[PDB]
Design an enzyme around this catalytic site. Structure first.
Site, mmCIF file in Angstrom:
data_model
loop_
_atom_site.group_PDB
_atom_site.id
_atom_site.type_symbol
_atom_site.label_atom_id
_atom_site.label_comp_id
_atom_site.label_asym_id
_atom_site.label_seq_id
_atom_site.Cartn_x
_atom_site.Cartn_y
_atom_site.Cartn_z
ATOM 1 N N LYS A 75 -28.136 8.529 46.152
ATOM 2 C CA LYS A 75 -27.024 9.354 45.708
ATOM 3 C C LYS A 75 -26.617 10.301 46.821
ATOM 4 C CE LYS A 75 -23.815 10.794 43.042
ATOM 5 N NZ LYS A 75 -23.029 10.895 44.317
ATOM 6 N N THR A 76 -25.326 10.315 47.142
ATOM 7 C CA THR A 76 -24.776 11.130 48.209
ATOM 8 C C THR A 76 -24.091 12.379 47.667
ATOM 9 O OG1 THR A 76 -22.723 9.870 48.053
ATOM 10 C CG2 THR A 76 -24.317 9.158 49.724
ATOM 11 N N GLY A 77 -23.787 13.284 48.584
ATOM 12 C CA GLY A 77 -22.809 14.327 48.336
ATOM 13 C C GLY A 77 -22.202 14.786 49.639
ATOM 14 N N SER A 102 -23.223 16.692 44.862
ATOM 15 C CA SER A 102 -23.223 15.531 43.990
ATOM 16 C C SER A 102 -24.574 14.848 43.892
ATOM 17 C CB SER A 102 -22.169 14.511 44.429
ATOM 18 O OG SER A 102 -20.872 14.998 44.109
ATOM 19 N N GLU A 138 -18.298 21.011 38.381
ATOM 20 C CA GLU A 138 -17.401 20.387 39.349
ATOM 21 C C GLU A 138 -16.011 20.968 39.141
ATOM 22 O OE1 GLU A 138 -18.162 18.656 41.732
ATOM 23 O OE2 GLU A 138 -19.957 17.482 41.314
ATOM 24 N N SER A 191 -19.619 8.604 41.989
ATOM 25 C CA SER A 191 -19.646 10.058 42.149
ATOM 26 C C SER A 191 -18.524 10.760 41.383
ATOM 27 C CB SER A 191 -19.640 10.459 43.620
ATOM 28 O OG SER A 191 -20.341 11.693 43.760
#
Length: 259
Positions: A205-207, A41, A137, A101
């Site tokens: 921004k994470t994933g 992500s 996704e 997200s």
């Protein structure tokens, strides 16, 4: 290299990738910074940047409504699921993709970019010849060791976020809006943000893909100092492993101490 990173990754049972750059002094800290990790992500912020570069706000493009169908909803669609009836503007899809997200939002941005291939072409246009997006996704989260599909490196990911947020790839309204979305992220409170001094401004921004992966990339502004760009990517050997948020926070604090 500073020995803290090897101790961190060994104790946590993870492969840890770190790259950070102080954009004022150009000093860097790197650990496995050119090794591949899942991008997952973290692509979503770059996809928003790509669309902002291909369609400036002054064109009105971000005001148009995308009427995606319920059949396009994938797992984890917190905003898009609530708007199937009405559609969402491109700007709203970007907000959802970055700050929540939202996975369907991410796919919708990819569609507007020409799919994973068009997104990857945008990365090449930043001088990133390493990162690549190949799938949509949520298949892009499989994170299988060795598989280069949908991967980046700490250094390449940091460079891309630096160019879009700190540098001048985007026009000024677009850079400001991308920055605002990242600063308003809601998913990162236990990762890079948890390793930084409370007073620094942070956008990130994470994933969290499979193989116990905990990813985060951030731009942070110490009070009245030039920004630092930080990418921290971690992954584990077992498909069903648990991501380690505190590993990301601890690696971040180590970066702060070294820089």
């Amino acid at each position: 290299a500073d020995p803290r990173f090897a101790a961190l990754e060994t104790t946590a049972g993870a492969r840890l990738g770190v790259f950070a750059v102080n954009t004022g002094s150009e000093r860097t800290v790197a650990h496995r910074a050119d090794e591949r990790f899942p991008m997952a992500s973290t692509f979503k912020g770059l996809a928003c940047g790509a669309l902002l570069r291909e369609h400036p706000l002054s064109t009105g493009y971000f005001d148009q409504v995308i009427h995606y169908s319920a059949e396009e909803l994938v797992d984890y669609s917190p905003v898009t699921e609530t708007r199937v009836e009405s559609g969402m503007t491109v700007a709203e899809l970007c907000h959802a993709a970055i700050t929540a997200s939202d996975n369907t939002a991410g796919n919708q941005l990819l569609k507007l970019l020409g799919g994973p291939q068009g997104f990857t072409a945008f990365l090449r246009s930043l001088g990133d010849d390493t990162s690549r997006l190949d799938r949509w996704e949520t298949e892009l989260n499989t994170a299988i060791p060795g598989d280069e599909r949908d991967t980046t490196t700490p250094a390449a990911l940091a460079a891309d976020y630096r160019a879009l947020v700190v540098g001048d790839v985007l026009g000024e309204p677009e850079r400001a809006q991308l920055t605002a979305w990242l600063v308003a992220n809601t998913t990162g409170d236990t990762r890079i943000r948890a390793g930084l001094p409370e007073d620094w401004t942070v956008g990130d921004k994470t994933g969290s893909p499979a193989y116990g992966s905990a990813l985060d990339v951030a731009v942070t502004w110490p009070s009245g100092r030039a920004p630092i760009v930080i990418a921290v990517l971690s992954t584990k050997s077992e498909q069903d492993a648990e991501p380690d948020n505190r590993l990301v926070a601890d690696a971040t604090r180590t970066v702060v101490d070294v820089l």
